[PDB]
Amino acid sequence: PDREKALELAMAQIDKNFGKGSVMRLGEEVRQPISVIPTGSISLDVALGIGGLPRGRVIEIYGPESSGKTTVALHAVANAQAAGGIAAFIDAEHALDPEYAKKLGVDTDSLLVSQPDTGEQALEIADMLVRSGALDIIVIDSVAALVPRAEIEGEGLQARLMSQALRKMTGALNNSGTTAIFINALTGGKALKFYASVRLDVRRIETLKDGTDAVGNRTRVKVVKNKVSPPFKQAEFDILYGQGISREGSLIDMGVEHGFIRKSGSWFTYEGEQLGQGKENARKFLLENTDVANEIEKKIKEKLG
Numbered sequence: 001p002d003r004e005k006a007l008e009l010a011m012a013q014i015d016k017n018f019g020k021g022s023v024m025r026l027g028e029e030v031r032q033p034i035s036v037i038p039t040g041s042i043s044l045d046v047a048l049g050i051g052g053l054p055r056g057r058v059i060e061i062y063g064p065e066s067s068g069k070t071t072v073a074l075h076a077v078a079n080a081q082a083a084g085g086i087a088a089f090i091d092a093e094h095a096l097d098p099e100y101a102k103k104l105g106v107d108t109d110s111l112l113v114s115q116p117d118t119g120e121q122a123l124e125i126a127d128m129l130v131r132s133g134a135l136d137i138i139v140i141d142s143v144a145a146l147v148p149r150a151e152i153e154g155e156g157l158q159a160r161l162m163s164q165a166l167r168k169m170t171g172a173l174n175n176s177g178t179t180a181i182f183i184n185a186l187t188g189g190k191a192l193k194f195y196a197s198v199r200l201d202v203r204r205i206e207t208l209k210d211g212t213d214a215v216g217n218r219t220r221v222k223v224v225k226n227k228v229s230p231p232f233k234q235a236e237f238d239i240l241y242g243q244g245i246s247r248e249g250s251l252i253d254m255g256v257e258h259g260f261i262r263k264s265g266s267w268f269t270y271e272g273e274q275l276g277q278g279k280e281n282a283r284k285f286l287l288e289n290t291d292v293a294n295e296i297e298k299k300i301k302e303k304l305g
């Protein structure tokens with residue numbers, strides 16, 4: 001009754017019993033199923049293990065304000081649509097800014113937005129839309145704003161309100177193939193924390209300036225809960241003030257550790273043809289000749305999945 005031999009037998013019996021990856025082995029580099037929505041953040045993409053949000057699963061993305069959570073999610077929408085997908089936004093914060101969005105690749109004019117009047121309302125006009133089997137992705141804004149009917153009328157539900165909608169709506173988008181993004185902001189999240197298949201921790205680390213007015217910021221995302229690929233991985237990226245995730249910038253951060261670029265004297269170089277000094281000067285260099293940037297994305301998309 002060899003150890004390893006006895007382990008895998010009882011172990012595989014679980015996936016059968018409770019789910020695909022109820023018991024994951026942190027090192028395993030397993031890859032199967034896929035069906036993901038790029039987050040336009042290569043880095044983060046790998047972090048997930050399958051290169052993007054698994055479609056057909058409830059995802060949580062918490063983090064304090066200004067953190068860039070919305071941005072990520074929106075990015076998720078650009079992609080989800082830039083591939084013929086139908087997006088649904090359940091605005092309950094009413095903070096959304098179109099101009100910024102449209103600058104990320106979102107097809108606003110063909111985006112579903114809805115501003116419910118009560119917690120219940122939101123959780124239905126959403127669940128309903130999911131059962132319509134038309135949406136590819138659907139974010140809901142601010143788990144918090146989802147206040148029970150009362151507490152708006154007369155006078156803890158919510159911890160209950162959320163629970164219900166989930167049990168129902170988890171099965172629904174489960175065989176619909178429509179990924180549901182929720183958005184926390186450090187209640188009901190005591191259940192979302194248990195339904196979500198992937199919960200993200202978005203929190204702003206640094207600030208990306210150049211003796212200028214600062215602009216964006218280096219964001220750190222730690223994927224504390226994952227059920228498709230192994231959990232706990234993490235990745236950082238740049239978010240430019242009014243422009244979004246620095247695909248180019250992310251391309252250098254990743255193109256330097258992976259050994260596809262070299263930094264001799266703070267002087268960037270991609271195999272014999274230098275890029276410039278500093279970072280803000282290099283991302284500016286790729287932002288031009290996309291064929292050069294394309295190779296690197298095409299190169300890192302090889303070193304890994």
Ligand SMILES: Nc1ncnc2c1ncn2[C@H]1C[C@H](O)[C@@H](COP(=O)(O)OP(=O)(O)OP(=O)(O)O)O1
Nearest residue numbers: 064065066067068069070071072185216217241242
């Ligand atoms: N009113 C604005 N004007 C110009 N750029 C903005 C504005 N709001 C956000 N941005 C851009 C630059 C900020 O660094 C970046 C922050 O990420 P965002 O996801 O928009 O914050 P957030 O999701 O953590 O806070 P919130 O809870 O308000 O949504 O988005």
